[PDB]
Structure formats: structure tokens, C-alpha cells
Design a protein around this ligand. Structure first.
Ligand SMILES: *[C@@H]1O[C@H](CO)[C@@H](O[C@@H]2O[C@H](CO)[C@@H](O)[C@H](O)[C@H]2NC(C)=O)[C@H](O)[C@H]1NC(C)=O
Ligand SMILES: *[C@@H]1O[C@H](CO)[C@@H](O)[C@H](O)[C@H]1NC(C)=O
Lengths: 48, 48, 48
């Protein structure tokens, strides 16, 4: 695991670049990865 | 639902208190299980 | 002088409530702000 550093990530089926840190917008059990306006990924839950 | 060789099943428990069995609404459906089998279906039948 | 001062003070006091109660008074700035935001949203959405 890497946090608070500009890294490249490859989660389950989604790939992108950018820093990733712990947040507070908790997910529901069925959720997998978040989103925001314009359908751009901005929040991903840890599979681990 | 049957799409792309998948059988997605969504369920939700909802208590009721009105005379009508179906309430007014304001309810959603949360995914519970997923079944990825590709089989063409044209009819369904319940079991009692 | 006293009557004119009273009228001026009354009008200055009333215009605050006129701005607060009327919702469309501040439209001409929210209009351009919303137009720019909408243009940016349409731009970013064009990626997909
Ligand atoms: C899955 O990843 C977790 C992340 O560390 C492993 O650690 C366990 O995590 C669970 C909750 O996610 C805790 O209840 C356990 O106490 C953790 N284990 C230990 C030894 O502290 C977990 O082991 C991983 N799953 C498997 C099957 O290994
Ligand atoms: C039946 O299912 C197969 C997938 O196993 C699919 O390719 C086909 O289009 C479906 N319909 C028919 C008429 O075969």
C-alpha cells in the first residue's frame, strides 16, 4: 500500500494516475468505486 | 435481468404498515447476489 | 432636512429586504457563473 504520494495505480478493472489518500465519504457495502461530476473517477475502495 | 450472459438479482426487505400491500414508495433496490451464467431465457415460473 | 433624511433611511433599510426576499434580484451574476460552469461541464463531459 502507498498513500500520500503521487503514484500510478491499477485497481480491479480501472487504471489511472494520481495521488490517493484516506477520505471520509464512506461507501455502502455493495459499492465498489466512487465517482463525481462528468463521470470521472475520484474515489476507490481498497479491495484489501 | 439477463444481459451479456449474466443473471443479476437485486433484492430489498421493506416493512409495510398500510392497508395496501404496496406502499406509496420512496424505496430503492440494493444488489444482493450476482450469477454470471450465459443461458437464454424466455419464461419463468415460481415455486410454491 | 429631517423628512428627507427619514425617507432616505427608510429606503436604504427597505432595499435590504427587497434584495433578500426577491430570489431573482441577483440573477445577472448567477447567470454568468452558471453559464460558465455549464460550458465547462459540457467541455469535460465531451471526453466520454
Ligand atoms: C485481507 O487483507 C487484510 C488486510 O490486512 C488481512 O488482514 C486481516 O484483515 C482483517 C480485516 O480486513 C482483520 O480482521 C484480520 O485481523 C487481519 N489479519 C491479521 C493477521 O491481523 C487479511 O488477512 C486478508 N485476508 C486473508 C484471507 O489473508
Ligand atoms: C443464446 O445464447 C447464446 C450464448 O450462449 C447467444 O450467443 C445467442 O445469441 C442466444 N440466442 C440464440 C437464438 O441462440
Amino acid at each position: 500500500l502507498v498513500k500520500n504520494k503521487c503514484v500510478n495505480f491499477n485497481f480491479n478493472g480501472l487504471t489511472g494516475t494520481g495521488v490517493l489518500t484516506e477520505s471520509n465519504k464512506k461507501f455502502l457495502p455493495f459499492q465498489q468505486f466512487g465517482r463525481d461530476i462528468a463521470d470521472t473517477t475520484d474515489a476507490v475502495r481498497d479491495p484489501q | 435481468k439477463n444481459i451479456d450472459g449474466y443473471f443479476k438479482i437485486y433484492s430489498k426487505h421493506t416493512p409495510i404498515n398500510l392497508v395496501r400491500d404496496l406502499p406509496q414508495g420512496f424505496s430503492a433496490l440494493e444488489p444482493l447476489v450476482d450469477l454470471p451464467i450465459g443461458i437464454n431465457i424466455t419464461r419463468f415460473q415460481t415455486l410454491l | 432636512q429631517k423628512l428627507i433624511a427619514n425617507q432616505f433611511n427608510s429606503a436604504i433599510g427597505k432595499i435590504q429586504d427587497s434584495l433578500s426576499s426577491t430570489p431573482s434580484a441577483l440573477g445577472k451574476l448567477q447567470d454568468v457563473v452558471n453559464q460558465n460552469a455549464q460550458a465547462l461541464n459540457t467541455l469535460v463531459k465531451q471526453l466520454s
